[PDB]
Design a protein around this ligand. Structure first.
Ligand SMILES: OC[C@H]1O[C@H](O[C@H]2O[C@H](CO)[C@@H](O)[C@H](O)[C@H]2O)[C@H](O)[C@@H](O)[C@@H]1O
Ligand SMILES: [Cl-]
Ligand SMILES: [Mg+2]
Length: 246
């Protein structure tokens, strides 16, 4: 249904760019700390943002600190934890805050329930919890069910499944509303949104980008509502390089 992306926009057009990180700008790794965005890709992203009035943001499930570590030394506008954290063009940060008791109780519950599922990792993000199972995919069901119970008992929380992960996020947080928040602010406002992603959390973004008359690009295999598809992360790199130097 999605058609292959074989054209690259002009460098100085009227576009606003949104990129996912893991699986879109950097190749998937067995461990999150092994992920690297090549320095030339970061330079190309900086040049694209510069020629489009700075209207380029990184929309990711990572925390903003890890996004800063990955994009160092560059400091882009950011949306982390699927939108629960954001940083606009002026550097102002917006953080969704959960009650302290909810965070404490949910963290304790997950830590205790994790013992009977070896190889799974619990990553606490302040206002979210990621359950990784790449080292032991057989627990994928269990974690899922477990998360489904948490969201049942704490209505403040919603589910976000993803590649080798089950995340529990604040309800109402999604990449679509993060892109929406960016698109009503300068310098993104007035430009055509472009969003490149690869996972389920990105579909929301795709939706809001399609309704706005923008360009949605899916990376990798799988069904999608994005209008365009790129085969792999190196193809995203080639696409970016073609934008910068046709
Ligand atoms: O590619 C390396 C890792 O990417 C994923 O993990 C990242 O993306 C998740 C998005 O939901 C975040 O929750 C997580 O904090 C990031 O580390 C993937 O889940 C991992 O298995 C990969 O090792
Ligand atoms: Cl993500
Ligand atoms: Mg991704």
């Amino acid at each position: 249904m999605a058609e292959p992306l074989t054209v690259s926009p002009e460098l100085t057009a009227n576009y606003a760019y949104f990129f996912d990180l893991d699986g879109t700008l950097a190749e998937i790794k067995p461990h999150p700390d092994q992920v690297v965005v090549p320095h030339k890709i970061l330079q190309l992203l900086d040049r694209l943002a510069a020629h489009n009035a700075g209207a380029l943001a990184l929309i990711s499930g990572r925390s903003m600190t890890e996004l800063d570590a990955l994009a160092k030394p560059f400091r882009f506008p950011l949306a982390g934890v699927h939108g629960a954290e954001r940083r606009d063009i002026n550097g102002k940060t917006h953080i969704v805050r959960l009650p302290e008791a909810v965070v404490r109780e949910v963290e304790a519950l997950l830590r205790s329930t994790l013992v009977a599922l070896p190889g799974t990792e619990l990553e606490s993000k302040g206002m979210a919890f990621a359950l990784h199972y790449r080292q032991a995919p057989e627990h994928e069901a269990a974690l899922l069910a477990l998360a489904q119970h948490v969201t049942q008992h704490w209505p403040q929380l919603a589910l976000q499944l993803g590649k080798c992960v089950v995340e529990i996020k604040p309800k109402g947080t999604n990449k679509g509303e993060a892109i929406a928040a960016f698109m009503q602010e300068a310098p993104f406002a007035g430009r055509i949104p472009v969003f490149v992603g690869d996972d389920l959390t990105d579909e929301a973004g795709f939706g809001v980008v399609n309704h706005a008359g923008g360009i949605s690009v899916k990376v990798g295999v799988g069904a999608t509502q994005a209008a365009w598809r790129l085969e792999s992360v190196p193809d995203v790199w080639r696409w970016l390089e073609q934008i910068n130097y046709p």
